[PDB]
Amino acid sequence: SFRFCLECNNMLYPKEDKENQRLLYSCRNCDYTELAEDPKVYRHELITNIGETAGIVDDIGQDPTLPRSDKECPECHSRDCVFFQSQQRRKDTNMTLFYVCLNCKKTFRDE
Amino acid sequence: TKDDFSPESKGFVENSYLRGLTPQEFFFHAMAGREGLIDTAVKTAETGYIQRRLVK
Amino acid sequence: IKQKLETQFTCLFCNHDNSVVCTLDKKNSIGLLECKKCNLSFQAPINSLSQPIDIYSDWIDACE
Amino acid sequence: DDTITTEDCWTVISAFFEEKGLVSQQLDSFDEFMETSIQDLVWEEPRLILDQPAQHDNINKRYEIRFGKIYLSRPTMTEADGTTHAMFPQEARLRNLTYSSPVYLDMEKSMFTSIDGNKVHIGKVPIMLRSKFCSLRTLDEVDLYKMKECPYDMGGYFVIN
Amino acid sequence: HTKSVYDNGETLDISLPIHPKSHIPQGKQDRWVVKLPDFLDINAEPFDPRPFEMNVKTHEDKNQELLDKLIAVNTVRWRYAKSETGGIFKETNSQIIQWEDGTYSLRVGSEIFDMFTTNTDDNYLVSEHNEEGILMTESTLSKSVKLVPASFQSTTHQKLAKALSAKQKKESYARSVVTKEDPEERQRRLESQENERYRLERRRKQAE
Amino acid sequence: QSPWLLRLELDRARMLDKQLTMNQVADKISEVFSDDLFVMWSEDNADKLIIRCRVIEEDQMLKRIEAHMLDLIALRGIPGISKVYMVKHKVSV
Amino acid sequence: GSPSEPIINFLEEWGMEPLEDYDPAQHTKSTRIFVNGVWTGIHRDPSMLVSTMRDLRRSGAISPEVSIIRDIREREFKIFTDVGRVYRPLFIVEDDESKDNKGELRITKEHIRKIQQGYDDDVYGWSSLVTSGVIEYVDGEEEETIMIAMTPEDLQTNDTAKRIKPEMSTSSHHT
Amino acid sequence: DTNPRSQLHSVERTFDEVIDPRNKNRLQSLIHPRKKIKAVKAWHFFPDTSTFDQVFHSLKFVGSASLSKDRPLNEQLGQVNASILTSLFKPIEINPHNKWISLYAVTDKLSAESFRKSFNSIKDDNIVNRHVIYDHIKDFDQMFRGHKKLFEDFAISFDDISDRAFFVPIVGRLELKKKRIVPGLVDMVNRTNYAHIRMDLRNPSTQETAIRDSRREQYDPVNYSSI
Amino acid sequence: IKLYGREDKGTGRTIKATLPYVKQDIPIVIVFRALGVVPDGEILQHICYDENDWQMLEMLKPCIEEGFVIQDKEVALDFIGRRGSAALGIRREKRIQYAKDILQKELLPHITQEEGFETRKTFFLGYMVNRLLLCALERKDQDDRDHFGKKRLDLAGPLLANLFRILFRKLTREIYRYMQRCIETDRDFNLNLAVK
Ligand SMILES: [Zn+2]
Ligand SMILES: [Zn+2]
Ligand SMILES: [Zn+2]
């Protein structure tokens, strides 16, 4: 996550002080400068799993084309649920199922 | 339904010609036959061109 | 690196056409327009996305 | 209630084919065209404008013409001797005519000046057979036979030459 | 540190005239902005039965007349009611109904329209002073309110559905006509007249 | 040297599957980069296998160095041979 | 082809909010509303809106050849009145849970008898069936969101000469 | 029901069936057609007499111009603040191409509170001379959209003691976005606006009051027509 | 709206947008500013709809870096106006007016045609860029070209309408030419002769 300038709404690029030895987020369109909280400047994931379970909506139980199972809900122990596979559509994607209860509407696995 | 990998959902015809196909099997079989016709009518020109170059 | 290109622009002093050459140096961020007949030189700053049309428009704005 | 058999489904399909027929899309599209599309195309650019700042006492004159309503008629045939009569598709087929109808447009002319119009025939549009603007739409079964038209014919085509 | 641009200190001695308000909000300077639907109209004028009866308009188009009838019967109005004690009181035909769930509904006669409230930030109401060219704020518009019909069986919804369904059914622009003669007769006769006058003009010019 | 730090987390399972040693990767980086980059590597027993680096406005320079490193560091094998399979051949002798 | 102005009027009447009053941070759960491919607004209760639009279309208030599509996965609600869309008719199954007729065809023997007679018991043809809500048209794009039984015998749950039907056992129940 | 007599009779029928808000029994008698939920409280819907003469516009900030987002500006103006509720807007236009809005507010909390209390309590004919000084804060770019119909939008204010609800017309909507001043035009910018503006509270003149009453005579002629 | 740059090649993955009557592609940030929304944060607000998705923000970062050089609406419109394929030598104000014209009209005409209605155009541009990013990040499959619900059939109506539009424009041009020729003679033309 990256922060924005509080006065002109531009991006806050990180900057390093030679004399003070501190990491600071500074806007290049002004003189505003705010002290950085964490040193994690950049992170790149070669193999990522985000978007696998992130594709979830709160009204997925009203879809009539989705199959319905009788798996046990971990939270409220309901007897009706709706399952589907991974929303990510790469070639390496697993065939595991995500179950959605019809009362608490949370996503849970079978393992 | 969505995410169905059963044989009947993805084009397995379990009936014979004597018994008669169901509409889903009929449509899948028509898709396969259309594939056959397209493949023949498309590869004929490439084969003819290869034969002409070989002869020349 | 200086880049020299022949352009079809019209000089506003000599009125001869197809006698305008654009010379832009991306290293020093400068652009030079020279008239092959009038021998006049126009200088304007250039950016990373600059094109000869930018310097030509800058020359037009400077002329008026 | 009672269950719905396959015969009920065939009754519903018979109702469908009794209402629509087999060439309903062609006739409906042509009827939509003739009814609204020609008028909308004419009204797309409804104003031609010519200006002339005459100085020969400066008088700025604008000349402009407006397009109004579209008028259509039933297809007609004009003979060499000058007479006219209603045309039917069998005659057009036999004599190699075109089954088409005249189109009329109202043009209004105004003469604007600042110091500082009836139906014109714009062409003939071929008529699709058995449509709302065809002569065979009204004819019943007997007059259809008298006109040498087959009652099994469904229309949906044009007769050009 | 963005230094303040303005430091001249020049000041205008402008005085604004303000009038007393008939009402004052209590506890919160909050107002709800409501979009006006097509089936609802606002008649700030007092209800006058005789001009209202004398100004009813009848049109051949049934859809337009039905829409006018629906909006007229659904229009928010008010009138002066003579009290039994001899005084005069303002009487209105519109009310606001709040249910047990906390939702609000606008009621005119027997018709009830639900309200959907959406929270809005940095939205305020201001008063324009054109003679001085400045805007004076009034209060804060915290929530935006949309008006929705309560149910299908409501007469307003049925009339709107009928009007919109029958409005797009009527579509006939081209008008039929009967041709009695050759349509190209005018063109050829005017071409003949133009050729004749061209010959006459050419002869006159050669003779001039 | 520079305050900027570059550490990359490598998958333990696939690193063991390829039968590779962290010291080997460190020597490869050292050879391709001489003394321009100081390198340290966590031992085998670490919970997460990591290997850091330090250079000796340079954030974009470090980003380009990281991209170049990810792109063209060859640990072992013949270049061009993407995958290798084992096959059994029936031969009459 | 049909005009889109009544569609926009109906949508604005039933709580649709325009784009100028839309903040993506605030509306992290609203549904985008498209009409003929034009994003015209947003809504926060798409279920009631799609139910109302479908009921209006089935009653004849909206033209039967208008497409009403709800993409739950992408949080979109698309409407098409364009010209050139290929459609086909289908029977309507009563899907209301609160109704007693759930899981059954809306068309009954009374409709068939009226069709055979040719008039209603205080012309009764195909259009009467379409505007009574027992039949409706669907195009290829709207077909992706519906669940179709092949035969009316499929709505209710060892011969060597008769053809064999799919079990469809992957789902415990079908609606 | 195309008869004008029928329409008039329907109008009087709607007028007569108004439920008294104090009548709790009749209020509980009313039932929601769909929700099937009884009514709790009621309010009369009335127009406002004292505000029809004035012109009201719905003013909104678009995007980054949000006061909540601008944390230093919000901290300077107070974390509802009377300074926000008593702010002044001054539209100045050098030319048709260049336009902006000037915003002023009271930095002091006590002065803003006193001004707001004095303004919200105007029901008599005695107004104290509150010489309040307004300080410039920020400038924004503006666009305006006009309403074809008069009562396109209306804001509703409530009054619990009288069980009424007063609504006011909205003429147009004003949208504001943050404007970055060009460094080459600061010389002309400094000559346009002012660092301070002093507001003096005075009793309205008789002629202006008569003009406003004449404007209000369109709505209410019983209590405001000139004699 | 093309997405230049191959995976792990070509340095940054810039997003350039092709515009009608414009000779060279344009980065999305510049045209976004030209429509009238300058701050980069609001550009990201228009494009993305969920701040926690750092991957799409990372993919938009090169576009922000490239577009940082332009920071004002008017210079953005001018940059649009230089490449607008018009006659060489047009003045700056006329270039800006030409950019305003080519931006209001002919840029997504199906949305709107009037002035001051570009908010919907900005939202639709954000929607298109969001769809492009969603497909690029392997979150969705590319659209099926052979899907039949995305096709249309033209019957006799539309075909005859297109043909009649062309022929009527030809007839109108003939009427215009005859009128121009006739005004030389200065006569009260019957107007039944201009029409062919
Ligand atoms: Zn900044
Ligand atoms: Zn549960
Ligand atoms: Zn020269």
| Burial class of residue B54, CB neighbours in 10 A (0-12, 13-18, 19+) | exposed
CA–CA separation, H137 vs H88, rounded Å? 10
Pick the closest to residue E20 from H214, H201, H225 (CA basis). Answer: H201
CA–CA separation, E123 vs E139, rounded Å? 9
Task: Record the tokens describing residue D111, joined without a space.
Answer: 């003469």
Look at phi and psi of residue H78 and say left if phi exceeds 0, alpha if psi is from -120 to 50, else beta: left
CA–CA separation, I69 vs C46, rounded Å? 11
CA–CA separation, C33 vs C57, rounded Å? 11
CA–CA separation, G170 vs A67, rounded Å? 7
Which residues in chain A have their CB less than 8 angstroms from residue B2's CB? 63, 65-67, 84
Length of chain I counted residue by residue: 196
I161–D41: do the CB atoms touch at under 8 Å? yes
Contact I149, G80 (CB under 8 A): no
Residue C22 marked in a binding site: no
Say whether G157 sits in a helix, a strand or coil: coil
Helix axis angle for I73-82 and C52-63, nearest 10°, is 110
Placement of tokens 């990013």 in the chain: I133
Task: Determine contact: H98 vs chain I, CB below 8 A.
Answer: no
Placement of tokens 């199954």 in the chain: G93
| Burial class of residue E197, CB neighbours in 10 A (0-12, 13-18, 19+) | exposed
Cβ pairs H/I, distance under 8 A: 17
Beta-carbon count within 10 A of A75 CB: 11
Pick the closest to residue B7 from G170, A7, H41, F15 (CA basis). Answer: G170
CA–CA separation, F54 vs F2, rounded Å? 7
Chain B: residue whose CA lies nearest to A67: B1
- Give the CATH number of the domain where residue C49 resides: 2.20.25.190
Contact G35, G8 (CB under 8 A): yes
CA–CA separation, H163 vs A74, rounded Å? 51
Ligand nearest to the CA of A4: 1
Task: Determine contact: H63 vs chain I, CB below 8 A.
Answer: yes
Chain A: residue whose CA lies nearest to G71: A63
Residue A81 marked in a binding site: no
| Burial class of residue H154, CB neighbours in 10 A (0-12, 13-18, 19+) | buried
- The parent domain of residue A96 ranges over 45-111
Residue A57 sits in the same domain as residue A94: yes
Length of chain B counted residue by residue: 56
CA–CA separation, A1 vs A15, rounded Å? 16
Residue A73 marked in a binding site: yes
Chain E: residue whose CA lies nearest to H161: E26
Distances G131 to G5, G57, I15, I54 between C-alpha atoms, Å:
21, 8, 49, 50
Name chain I's partners: 3 or more CB pairs within 8 A.
A, C, D, E, F, G, H
Task: Determine contact: I160 vs chain D, CB below 8 A.
Answer: yes
A13-16: strand order across its sheet:
A13-16, A23-26, A33-35
Which residues in chain B have their CB less than 8 angstroms from residue A88's CB? none
Distances H150 to E16, E43, H147, I140 between C-alpha atoms, Å:
26, 11, 7, 48
Helix (H) / strand (E) element for I187: namely: none
Residues sharing a CB contact under 8 Å with residue F50, sequence separation 6 or more, in sequence order? F7, F8, F9, F10, F41, F42
Ligand nearest to the CA of A73: 2
Task: Determine contact: I37 vs chain H, CB below 8 A.
Answer: yes
Residues sharing a CB contact under 8 Å with residue E83, sequence separation 6 or more, in sequence order? E89
DSSP I141: P
A9–H178: do the CB atoms touch at under 8 Å? yes
Say whether B56 sits in a helix, a strand or coil: coil
CA–CA separation, I36 vs I125, rounded Å? 13
Residue A45 marked in a binding site: no
Paired residues of A108 in beta bridges: A99
CA–CA separation, E130 vs E136, rounded Å? 11
Task: Record the tokens describing residue H23, joined without a space.
Answer: 């009548």
Residue A27 marked in a binding site: yes
CA–CA separation, F13 vs E84, rounded Å? 93
The number of distinct structural domains making up chain C is 1
User: How are beta strands G31-35 and G76-80 bridged, if at all?
Assistant: parallel
User: How are beta strands F5-9 and E175-176 bridged, if at all?
Assistant: unpaired
Contact G64, G77 (CB under 8 A): no
Task: Record the tokens describing residue H40, joined without a space.
Answer: 């709790």
CA–CA separation, H178 vs I27, rounded Å? 23
H helical segments located in chain A: none
Cβ pairs E/H, distance under 8 A: 287
Distance of CA B28 to the CA centre of its chain: 8
Task: Record the tokens describing residue G96, joined without a space.
Answer: 């209301």
CA–CA separation, F19 vs F41, rounded Å? 17
Chain G: residue whose CA lies nearest to E166: G61
C8–I88: do the CB atoms touch at under 8 Å? yes
Exposure string over B13-30, b if 16+ CB within 10 A, otherwise e: beeeeeeebbeebeebee
Residue A103 marked in a binding site: yes
DSSP H38: B
Which residues in chain A have their CB less than 8 angstroms from residue B3's CB? 67, 83-85
D26–I155: do the CB atoms touch at under 8 Å? yes
Q: How far away is chain E from the Cα of D25, in angstroms, using its nearest Cα?
A: 18
Q: Residue G172 Cα, ligand 2 centroid: separation in angstroms?
A: 17
Placement of tokens 């003070």 in the chain: A20
- Give the CATH number of the domain where residue A39 resides: 2.20.25.10
Residue A110 sits in the same domain as residue A92: yes
Contact H103, H133 (CB under 8 A): no
Residue A35 sits in the same domain as residue A82: no
Residue A2 sits in the same domain as residue A39: yes
Residue A1 sits in the same domain as residue A19: yes
Residue type, E110: S
CA–CA separation, I132 vs I47, rounded Å? 10
Which contacts of E100-105 are long-range, i.e. CB under 8 A and separated by 24 or more positions?
E100/H37, E100/H38, E100/H40, E101/H35, E101/H37, E104/E145, E105/E150, E105/H32
Rg of chain A (C-alpha set): 22
The number of distinct structural domains making up chain A is 2
Residue A26 sits in the same domain as residue A64: no
F3–A14: do the CB atoms touch at under 8 Å? no
Paired residues of C30 in beta bridges: C25, C45
CA–CA separation, D101 vs D111, rounded Å? 33
Experimental method, per PDB record = cryo-EM
CA–CA separation, A56 vs A66, rounded Å? 14
Residues sharing a CB contact under 8 Å with residue G73, sequence separation 6 or more, in sequence order? A55, A57, A60, A63, A87
Rg of chain E (C-alpha set): 32
Q: Do chains E and F touch (3 or more CB pairs under 8 A)?
A: no
Task: Record the tokens describing residue H68, joined without a space.
Answer: 């909540």
Three-class HEC string of E91-109: EECEEEEEECCCCEEEEEC
Task: Record the tokens describing residue A90, joined without a space.
Answer: 């790469």
Look at phi and psi of residue G15 and say left if phi exceeds 0, alpha if psi is from -120 to 50, else beta: left
Q: Residue C42 Cα, ligand 3 centroid: separation in angstroms?
A: 12
Task: Determine contact: D11 vs chain I, CB below 8 A.
Answer: no
Distance of CA D31 to the CA centre of its chain: 8
CA–CA separation, E70 vs E158, rounded Å? 10
Which contacts of A7-13 are long-range, i.e. CB under 8 A and separated by 24 or more positions?
A7/A32, A7/E2, A7/H70, A7/H72, A8/A32, A8/H64, A8/H178, A8/H180, A8/I39, A9/H63, A9/H64, A9/H69, A9/H178, A9/I39, A9/I40, A9/I41, A9/I42, A10/I39, A10/I40, A10/I41, A11/I40, A11/I41, A11/I64
Say if domain I1-152 classifies as CATH 3.40.50.10540: no
CA–CA separation, A73 vs A105, rounded Å? 10
Alpha-carbon torsion (E58, E63, E67, E70), positive or negative: positive
Which residues in chain I have their CB less than 8 angstroms from residue D25's CB? 155
Angle subtended at Cα G106 by Cα G101 and Cα G108, rounded to the nearest 5 degrees: 105
CA–CA separation, I105 vs I85, rounded Å? 16
- The parent domain of residue C55 ranges over 1-64
Picking from H180, H181, H182, H185 by the largest number of I CB atoms within 10 A of its own CB, the best residue to mutate is H180
Q: Do chains D and H touch (3 or more CB pairs under 8 A)?
A: no
CA–CA separation, F13 vs B22, rounded Å? 49
H helical segments located in G77-157: 109-117, 126-131
I46–G139: do the CB atoms touch at under 8 Å? no
Three-class HEC string of D11-79: HHHHHHHHHCCCCHHHHHHHHHHHHHHHHHHHHHCCEEEEEEEECCCCEEEEEEEEEEEEEECCCEEEC
Helix (H) / strand (E) element for E115: namely: strand E111-119
